[PDB]
């Protein structure tokens, strides 16, 4: 019952919930064979840990702080002064220092443009031969929105995406077994990224502007002293990498569930207004992730029935824990019209995900547009998926954008 567990057996990145669910089902709280870290699977377990202050994100309460002191030395600032190497009081700091920025409000401004990329892409390979909404449409949307907002040309949109992607992978190669990528060229995009990063931020100081992002931090770190040059290229690097595969996933996920069911996509038609409902579903319904976020205890205890390992890694199996019977009425479901207010696809607590509303902006439009002028879309081929250690990640989604 708390037994297997094969978060990378092919197979699972396509559907995880018919294996995940048993563990789920019988055990509350499991330990991962080879993980040395236990595994939450049920909801109102998996959320308390969340908003728990006897749990910690970083390594200064893990089995070995002296363990990131090691293998891929390049990220050492960006895991020690990043959003998750910040003791708590450092962390709420920053966050309020950068919260406000992230408001559905502030970010409203990046529609136009988002719109316009989106545009560009769907007109430019249709009426061509085959589309893959992957590769050539998800792909080309996350990092334009990120470069909008860090004021930043469309030039450097390939370097950073490229960032982002072998940052993600490598910042969990402490937390999961393999990769997708090789080590050799992952540290060249890192080398390569935090180098752009650099001329970015040394221009920016040069030519400061008015209402803006990088301004604004360049400032409050020499400036009253709220943030470090550490904490500040930490935050910003952060970032991109957090914010590029997530909503990619999402974009395909979403298109992928609206094909997977005509009922949910014949009610979006009927009323657009449900598209950021929908959106939210997706996420709840079938989780972008492989296992979930991950947790460190700071002390001894034994939270249902299990004694921890004073630093000991613990997984919060998201996928499950959204697919609750108890919280969520017909869980195995895609409903769109259902209450989602208890997604946790976007956390909770301190870390809660500040680029949520920038996640939903992106996919609202980019789902939005697609279907409105491809509305006859069908599925071509099975989708691929992957192997990412963080998320189901799907590698291909081609469709046919008008059949005959
Ligand atoms: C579909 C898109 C996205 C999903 C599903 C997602 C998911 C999440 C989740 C679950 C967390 C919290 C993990 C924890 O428990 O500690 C998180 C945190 C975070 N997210 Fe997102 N995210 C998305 C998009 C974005 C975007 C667009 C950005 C930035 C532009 C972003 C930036 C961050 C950052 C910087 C954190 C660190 C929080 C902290 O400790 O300060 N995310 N995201």
Redesign the pocket.
Known sequence: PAFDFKPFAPGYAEDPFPAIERLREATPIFYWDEGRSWVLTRYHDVSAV?RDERFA?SREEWESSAEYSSAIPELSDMKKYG??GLPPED?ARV?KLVNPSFTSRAIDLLRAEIQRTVDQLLDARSGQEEFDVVRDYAEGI?MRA?SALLKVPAECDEKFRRFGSATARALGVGLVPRVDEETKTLVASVTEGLALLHGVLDERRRNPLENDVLTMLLQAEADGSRLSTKELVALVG??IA??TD??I??IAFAVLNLLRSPEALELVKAEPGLMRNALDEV?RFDN?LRIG?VRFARQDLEYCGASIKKGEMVFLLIPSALRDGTVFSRPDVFDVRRDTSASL???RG???????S??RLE?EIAVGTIFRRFPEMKLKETPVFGYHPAFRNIESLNVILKPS
């Open positions: 969340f994100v959003l998750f962390h966050r996350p990120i952060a970032i957090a914010g997530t909503t996933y999402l996420l972008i976020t696809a976007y956390g301190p870390h809660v995900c500040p680029g949520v920038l996640a996919a």
